[PDB]
Design a protein around this motif. Sequence first.
Motif, PDB file in Angstrom:
ATOM      1  N   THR A 180      61.405   0.302   6.387  1.00 12.11           N
ATOM      2  CA  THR A 180      60.564  -0.406   5.403  1.00 12.11           C
ATOM      3  C   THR A 180      59.197   0.273   5.299  1.00 12.11           C
ATOM      4  O   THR A 180      58.659   0.758   6.299  1.00 12.11           O
ATOM      5  CB  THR A 180      60.367  -1.875   5.794  1.00 12.11           C
ATOM      6  N   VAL A 181      58.705   0.360   4.069  1.00 16.42           N
ATOM      7  CA  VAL A 181      57.402   0.977   3.771  1.00 16.42           C
ATOM      8  C   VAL A 181      56.592   0.069   2.829  1.00 16.42           C
ATOM      9  O   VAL A 181      56.946  -0.051   1.650  1.00 16.42           O
ATOM     10  CB  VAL A 181      57.567   2.398   3.207  1.00 16.42           C
ATOM     11  N   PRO A 182      55.459  -0.448   3.309  1.00 19.62           N
ATOM     12  CA  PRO A 182      54.493  -1.204   2.490  1.00 19.62           C
ATOM     13  C   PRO A 182      53.654  -0.255   1.629  1.00 19.62           C
ATOM     14  O   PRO A 182      52.429  -0.171   1.722  1.00 19.62           O
ATOM     15  CB  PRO A 182      53.644  -1.941   3.534  1.00 19.62           C
ATOM     16  N   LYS A 211      63.147   8.170  13.123  1.00 17.12           N
ATOM     17  CA  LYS A 211      61.702   8.170  13.368  1.00 17.12           C
ATOM     18  C   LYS A 211      61.223   6.817  13.907  1.00 17.12           C
ATOM     19  O   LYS A 211      61.971   5.848  13.799  1.00 17.12           O
ATOM     20  CB  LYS A 211      60.922   8.501  12.104  1.00 17.12           C
ATOM     21  N   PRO A 212      60.166   6.850  14.724  1.00 17.27           N
ATOM     22  CA  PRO A 212      59.468   5.644  15.202  1.00 17.27           C
ATOM     23  C   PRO A 212      58.439   5.171  14.163  1.00 17.27           C
ATOM     24  O   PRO A 212      58.144   5.870  13.200  1.00 17.27           O
ATOM     25  CB  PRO A 212      58.797   6.115  16.494  1.00 17.27           C
ATOM     26  N   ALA A 213      57.944   3.952  14.320  1.00 14.31           N
ATOM     27  CA  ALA A 213      56.920   3.383  13.419  1.00 14.31           C
ATOM     28  C   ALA A 213      55.651   4.246  13.404  1.00 14.31           C
ATOM     29  O   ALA A 213      54.965   4.371  14.418  1.00 14.31           O
ATOM     30  CB  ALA A 213      56.576   1.959  13.862  1.00 14.31           C
ATOM     31  N   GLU A 265      53.342   7.174  10.358  1.00  9.96           N
ATOM     32  CA  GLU A 265      52.939   7.585   9.006  1.00  9.96           C
ATOM     33  C   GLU A 265      53.516   8.967   8.705  1.00  9.96           C
ATOM     34  O   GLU A 265      53.378   9.876   9.526  1.00  9.96           O
ATOM     35  CB  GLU A 265      51.414   7.655   8.948  1.00  9.96           C
ATOM     36  N   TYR A 266      54.112   9.108   7.527  1.00 10.27           N
ATOM     37  CA  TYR A 266      54.798  10.353   7.152  1.00 10.27           C
ATOM     38  C   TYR A 266      54.743  10.543   5.633  1.00 10.27           C
ATOM     39  O   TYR A 266      54.578   9.585   4.876  1.00 10.27           O
ATOM     40  CB  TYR A 266      56.277  10.316   7.569  1.00 10.27           C
ATOM     41  N   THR A 267      54.837  11.798   5.234  1.00  7.47           N
ATOM     42  CA  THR A 267      54.954  12.180   3.819  1.00  7.47           C
ATOM     43  C   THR A 267      56.439  12.163   3.436  1.00  7.47           C
ATOM     44  O   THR A 267      57.329  12.255   4.283  1.00  7.47           O
ATOM     45  CB  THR A 267      54.343  13.564   3.576  1.00  7.47           C
ATOM     46  N   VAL A 268      56.686  12.100   2.140  1.00  6.28           N
ATOM     47  CA  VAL A 268      58.039  11.968   1.577  1.00  6.28           C
ATOM     48  C   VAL A 268      59.051  13.018   2.078  1.00  6.28           C
ATOM     49  O   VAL A 268      60.182  12.687   2.422  1.00  6.28           O
ATOM     50  CB  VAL A 268      57.815  11.985   0.057  1.00  6.28           C
ATOM     51  N   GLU A 269      58.609  14.275   2.079  1.00  4.77           N
ATOM     52  CA  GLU A 269      59.443  15.420   2.469  1.00  4.77           C
ATOM     53  C   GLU A 269      59.926  15.382   3.915  1.00  4.77           C
ATOM     54  O   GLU A 269      60.946  15.982   4.239  1.00  4.77           O
ATOM     55  CB  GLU A 269      58.729  16.737   2.156  1.00  4.77           C
ATOM     56  N   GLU A 270      59.152  14.722   4.775  1.00  5.93           N
ATOM     57  CA  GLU A 270      59.537  14.557   6.184  1.00  5.93           C
ATOM     58  C   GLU A 270      60.908  13.871   6.339  1.00  5.93           C
ATOM     59  O   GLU A 270      61.324  13.103   5.461  1.00  5.93           O
ATOM     60  CB  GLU A 270      58.488  13.760   6.957  1.00  5.93           C
ATOM     61  N   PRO A 271      61.617  14.231   7.410  1.00  8.46           N
ATOM     62  CA  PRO A 271      62.896  13.602   7.779  1.00  8.46           C
ATOM     63  C   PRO A 271      62.664  12.436   8.747  1.00  8.46           C
ATOM     64  O   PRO A 271      62.170  12.611   9.863  1.00  8.46           O
ATOM     65  CB  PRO A 271      63.670  14.744   8.435  1.00  8.46           C
ATOM     66  N   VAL A 272      63.077  11.256   8.309  1.00  4.09           N
ATOM     67  CA  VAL A 272      62.960  10.022   9.105  1.00  4.09           C
ATOM     68  C   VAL A 272      64.212   9.637   9.919  1.00  4.09           C
ATOM     69  O   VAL A 272      64.207   8.692  10.705  1.00  4.09           O
ATOM     70  CB  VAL A 272      62.431   8.884   8.225  1.00  4.09           C
ATOM     71  N   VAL A 273      65.314  10.312   9.641  1.00  2.00           N
ATOM     72  CA  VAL A 273      66.606   9.968  10.263  1.00  2.00           C
ATOM     73  C   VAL A 273      67.661  11.028   9.967  1.00  2.00           C
ATOM     74  O   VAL A 273      67.597  11.731   8.960  1.00  2.00           O
ATOM     75  CB  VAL A 273      67.053   8.550   9.820  1.00  2.00           C
ATOM     76  N   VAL A 274      68.609  11.096  10.880  1.00  2.00           N
ATOM     77  CA  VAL A 274      69.824  11.901  10.718  1.00  2.00           C
ATOM     78  C   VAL A 274      71.048  11.005  10.958  1.00  2.00           C
ATOM     79  O   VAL A 274      71.121  10.247  11.936  1.00  2.00           O
ATOM     80  CB  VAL A 274      69.731  13.103  11.669  1.00  2.00           C
ATOM     81  N   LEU A 275      72.058  11.249  10.148  1.00  2.00           N
ATOM     82  CA  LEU A 275      73.321  10.507  10.232  1.00  2.00           C
ATOM     83  C   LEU A 275      74.459  11.458  10.563  1.00  2.00           C
ATOM     84  O   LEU A 275      74.286  12.650  10.364  1.00  2.00           O
ATOM     85  CB  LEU A 275      73.580   9.874   8.873  1.00  2.00           C
ATOM     86  N   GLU A 276      75.594  10.922  11.019  1.00  2.00           N
ATOM     87  CA  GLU A 276      76.783  11.697  11.420  1.00  2.00           C
ATOM     88  C   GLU A 276      76.405  13.039  12.079  1.00  2.00           C
ATOM     89  O   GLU A 276      76.856  14.110  11.677  1.00  2.00           O
ATOM     90  CB  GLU A 276      77.697  11.887  10.193  1.00  2.00           C
ATOM     91  N   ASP A 277      75.369  12.980  12.924  1.00  2.00           N
ATOM     92  CA  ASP A 277      74.811  14.184  13.572  1.00  2.00           C
ATOM     93  C   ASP A 277      74.434  15.309  12.570  1.00  2.00           C
ATOM     94  O   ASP A 277      74.810  16.468  12.716  1.00  2.00           O
ATOM     95  CB  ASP A 277      75.817  14.673  14.623  1.00  2.00           C
ATOM     96  N   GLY A 278      73.722  14.963  11.512  1.00  2.00           N
ATOM     97  CA  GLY A 278      73.334  15.981  10.514  1.00  2.00           C
ATOM     98  C   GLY A 278      73.918  15.783   9.120  1.00  2.00           C
ATOM     99  O   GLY A 278      74.777  16.544   8.689  1.00  2.00           O
ATOM    100  N   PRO A 292      60.811   1.435  11.292  1.00  2.83           N
ATOM    101  CA  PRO A 292      62.229   1.568  11.668  1.00  2.83           C
ATOM    102  C   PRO A 292      62.912   0.211  11.608  1.00  2.83           C
ATOM    103  O   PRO A 292      62.476  -0.666  12.355  1.00  2.83           O
ATOM    104  CB  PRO A 292      62.245   1.982  13.143  1.00  2.83           C
ATOM    105  N   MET A 293      64.052   0.148  10.971  1.00  2.00           N
ATOM    106  CA  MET A 293      64.892  -1.072  10.862  1.00  2.00           C
ATOM    107  C   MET A 293      66.335  -0.798  11.306  1.00  2.00           C
ATOM    108  O   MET A 293      67.284  -1.466  10.902  1.00  2.00           O
ATOM    109  CB  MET A 293      64.870  -1.583   9.417  1.00  2.00           C
ATOM    110  N   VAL A 294      66.468   0.190  12.184  1.00  2.00           N
ATOM    111  CA  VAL A 294      67.753   0.647  12.725  1.00  2.00           C
ATOM    112  C   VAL A 294      67.468   1.433  14.007  1.00  2.00           C
ATOM    113  O   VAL A 294      66.510   2.206  14.094  1.00  2.00           O
ATOM    114  CB  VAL A 294      68.447   1.533  11.680  1.00  2.00           C
TER     115      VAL A 294
END
Lengths: 37, 52, 561, 123, 450
Positions: C121-123, C145-147, C149-162, C105-107
């Motif tokens: 950020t993803v190494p 999302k918090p720091a 491990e996740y797959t690509v399809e997973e949602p890491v964040v939502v903006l403008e409430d969706g 997470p960087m936000v």
Amino acid sequence: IPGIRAQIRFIQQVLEQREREDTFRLKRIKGKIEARE
Amino acid sequence: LEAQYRERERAETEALLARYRERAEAEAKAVREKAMARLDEAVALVLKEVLP
Amino acid sequence: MIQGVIQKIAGPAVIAKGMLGARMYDICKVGEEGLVGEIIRLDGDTAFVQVYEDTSGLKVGEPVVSTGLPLAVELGPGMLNGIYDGIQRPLVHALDREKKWAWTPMVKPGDEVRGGMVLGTVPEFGFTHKILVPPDVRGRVKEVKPAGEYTVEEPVVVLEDGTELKMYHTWPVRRARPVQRKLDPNTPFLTGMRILDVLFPVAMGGTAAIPGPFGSGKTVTQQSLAKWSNADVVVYVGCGERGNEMTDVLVEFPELTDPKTGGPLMHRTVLIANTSNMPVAAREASIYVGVTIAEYFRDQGFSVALMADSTSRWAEALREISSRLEEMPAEEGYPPYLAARLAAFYERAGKVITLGGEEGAVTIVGAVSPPGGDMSEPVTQSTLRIVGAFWRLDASLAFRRHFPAINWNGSYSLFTSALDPWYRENVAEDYPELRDAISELLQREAGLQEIVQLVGPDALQDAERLVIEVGRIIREDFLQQNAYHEVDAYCSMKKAYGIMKMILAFYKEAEAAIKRGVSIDEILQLPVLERIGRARYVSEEEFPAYFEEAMKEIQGAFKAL
Amino acid sequence: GELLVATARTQARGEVLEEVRRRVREALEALPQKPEWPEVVRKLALEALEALPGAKALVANPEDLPHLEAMARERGVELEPALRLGVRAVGAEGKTQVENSLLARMDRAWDAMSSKVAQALWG
Amino acid sequence: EYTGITYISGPLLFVENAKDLAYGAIVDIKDGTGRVRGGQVIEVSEEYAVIQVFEETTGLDLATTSVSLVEDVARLGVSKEMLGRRFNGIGKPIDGLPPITPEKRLPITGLPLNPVARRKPEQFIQTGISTIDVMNTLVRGQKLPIFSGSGLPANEIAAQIARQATVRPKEEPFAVVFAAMGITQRELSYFIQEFERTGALSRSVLFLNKADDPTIERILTPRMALTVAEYLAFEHDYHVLVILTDMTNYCEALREIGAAREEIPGRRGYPGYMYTDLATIYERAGVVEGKKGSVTQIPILSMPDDDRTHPIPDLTGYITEGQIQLSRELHRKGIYPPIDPLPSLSRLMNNGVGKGKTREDHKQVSDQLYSAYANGVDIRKLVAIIGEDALTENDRRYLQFADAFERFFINQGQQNRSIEESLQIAWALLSMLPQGELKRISKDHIGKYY
Ligand SMILES: Nc1ncnc2c1ncn2[C@@H]1O[C@H](COP(=O)(O)OP(=O)(O)O)[C@@H](O)[C@H]1O
């Protein structure tokens, strides 16, 4: 001096080669556009 | 020397071939006879695949 | 019938499709057989589709489905080390759905974001992948999302409430990715090759065409650049492959090393193959998929090189699609639309100030392969009009064993002045003056050789013989470079100027000695000359010592008189 | 002389294949003049309508007629064109053309299993 | 299923089917013909009609004539027994022997097997010709064109390589696939006789397409040949050498139909698709999966009108690992083989030379001979400009070196030179040059080998 006319003659014919034949793949392409349409 | 070398090969390029003629036809006869008894089995395999 | 359709007819390479009511123009569609196609014509009662493969695998009644992507590309973790084709897919998915990536997470929730903003950020591969808010999306981060491990399809964040954001995103290869501004050509793309860096500079984010007949060394310039250029990432679109140029790269490049690190070059590369069995559609989209991936890496703040094998073959694939669509043929039967398109491609090149500050760049090197020496249409003509740089491999220079085989008379960098200050400030104050002086030498030689071709060389004055002598040393000792030598395979900027000053200093001394009635024959057999000839093989500055060795030797010639 | 052998085997191997075929075709040619021939004829015409084509009708020799008026009464109908040992079908007015013949299908077999018959003959 | 011709224009025939349309690429058979006449489906026009391309002449066709769908495209009767046989462009016997007994039936377009590995060409193929083996070494998996012109003995070279080629101690068996396209009856009889007499036929599959054979059969010839090569290499683990003469003649046939197909012509009247059809042939070469076998190509590219810039020969260069370019001018000077030493190259040459392969000085010697020969040839021009006597002593040595290179290195009195023999001749001729003028040979090699 007949060196001039010599290899430089090769000159005129790669020159002439280049396009009465190239200029022709062409009078004929454009035919070809609405020649084909 | 050539006189006894050219006639050497001819007396072999006859014996050798002439032997092949005995080999070839005896191996022609040897492919027919294996086929001609175990044959109806082939005819069977074919017919059984045309009338389906 | 909005998301899928059924083949009405197929033959003559176009599939006519009933339905697909929501398909976009230029979207990839999928046939049941597994082939892909591009929606070319949208009509009131059908969609015309270009098939990227063999059309006998398509029959009337076959089901067709949208992909939703412009021809689109996936842009997220899993791109590096990957090998795709014209339309991105393992040499089928694009990005691994199972692979787990460490998201950082960087936000924080409450932050206000805009398209291009870095939220994580993803190494994935060192490289550090930078997760960005897709272009055209802004608002407030309501969930992140918090720091872990996740797959690509997973949602890491939502903006403008969706709007939901993932680690990847899709983008139409046909549409150049947005940016705030394009910066002006300022920083040279340090190649390490003396002729290029000196005489025909490429700027970071510049477009420099590579053009010439088949077998002149066009690809090789590109490959050496990747092995040694100052770009962190390379995007190679190894198009126009044939006979075995596919397998030639398939198990070969996976062994090529990164001269800078001593690790595989593929470890910082993305391959985009364009084989003959592939539909014209895929090869057409290949430059757009590559440029988008290239723009993606520059967004991180990397300088990337985009090498396009080649656009001649891309224009032939496009002419095939156009003629099948019955678009009116023009010159060489090419569609009218090509010039604007090709230009639009090269326009996406440039060094920018990425979203959220930071600078990155995409430099393009495109191969030019005219139908055969004619050097007209398609490729060359349109390209040489866009690109700012052209490195002309010359078959006659090659036959003469002058490497690199770059014609110093027919090549041009509109970039010479653009990059001169980088050289003056970082390498040598006299870079521009030195290359101008060498070029004037080569220019003078060319004129002299033309005359000699007529009146012979016997009438030549000592002054003119000296100019040919030094002109020859420039060609043999400088222009020519040995790609096969462990040392001369790459020539650092520092080494390029030092060799230039040895040659130019020998010139001044040569002209000075002649002016004092020194026999040219005496200078021609000067001992230092043989050392100047092997200078390209020295990996130590022992080379600038040759300047003093040159001066004293001329003095020994001023002594004997 | 080595070539002189391979060819002499090839001629022999040929003659045997060409006799296995001679017989296989004698079987089908004299097939109509025996029982179980009617069950063959109908089953061919079945696939003609059972396959891709929509229904309409079929045809044959006038001696396949005594053995081909069954589904003729089921809205199809039979019709010599010298069909020999086979039956054409008409899928619609737009002919479509589906033909199920024993000779035609034999030929699509003497190439399908050229090895298997050889495998049974010699190997 | 059967159809009826609804239209005929030269090689293009439209065919309407009432039931079941044949898919694109299917082979259809025209009924009522003395000789087999195949129609290959090219397009679905709509209204149950397909558009096709004939594999033989369409004279005598009538509208309504019947056509059957064979249910598949065309194919290769694949077997190790392909070796020792002479066939047509379509793989039908020409040697009076029985038709091939297939182990597998393979499609011929290149889709079958997916045989190639993603590995670089490597290891030696001994052609037995010094100007190839020594200076421009052919490597397993490479595409090395013979570049020639009308009147030159390119076919003699092709036939000689077919007779002589081997893979010196390889654990793998070696085979040749020789394909000729648009040749005369006289040439066909000659090629046949040559393969049979020499016993080269024992390890070769030969495909011969005559000038009067159908144009479509000529187009299929290289595909039959490449499919056989890939089968032998991949399924039998063989190093296979494919010799294709003449690619220019193949191109004349492909070009001949492009017009009948409705395309707008490209430069020089050629098909617009010239490079992407030609790519389907040059893509088919390299090491095969398993690395026991490989497919190597030696395509012949004659210059039409001796013009190496004609689109056909010019597009072929990229498909090769070694090129041997023949020149009429050189042939007219009596130099045979008539190889242009400044226009013959090896793309993958560096992968087959050096210590443990040939010899450590091979690259240096090759570089120096090439440089000296190119300088010597330019000096022939300078001699013409200024006169022989006005040439410098140093230039005279380079002038003379060009003659020495041609007389002694290029010219072979038919003769199988080992790479050691070829390097020795190279060093012998190099002695003519001043040692101080050997810019491209490191001192380590001069001391050890000069
Ligand atoms: N820098 C070079 N040094 C030496 N030979 C070269 C060089 N560049 C090209 N060549 C020769 O030309 C051949 C074809 O070069 P390449 O770049 O692959 O052609 P293209 O311009 O068609 O891409 C190479 O395999 C090599 O033999």
